[PDB]
């Protein structure tokens, strides 16, 4: 009834705070998980670019 609903609503407020801490926990994982993915992609294209510049200076000196 309404009385059990108010009680399970207090417990649902605890549960909602529990989902909010779990959701911000998953977010605090995956924001920087996405950003380490992009940091990998950045450093990878930069290492390839270094190899490209070495290739061009070597071919033109040959």
């Amino acid at each position: 009834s309404k009385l059990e609903a108010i009680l399970s609503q207090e417990v649902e407020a605890e549960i909602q705070a529990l989902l909010q801490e779990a959701e911000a926990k998953a977010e605090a994982v995956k924001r920087e998980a996405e950003e380490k993915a992009k940091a990998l992609l950045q450093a990878r294209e930069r290492a390839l670019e270094a190899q490209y510049r070495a290739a061009l200076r070597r071919a033109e000196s040959a």
Binding site: K2, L3, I6, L7
Partner: protein
Amino acid sequence: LWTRAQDEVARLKALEELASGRFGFALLGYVPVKAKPKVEEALARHKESV
């Protein structure tokens, strides 16, 4: 101070006689029929009068 302390200590000792319902709780006892209106007047102070 002694009166408030004896009152709070009696409330604490009375809290030992409760009957929990797994994050929820019940209680039971007896009282006369002549104070049943006073019992209801006390019962109104519960949250939705649980």
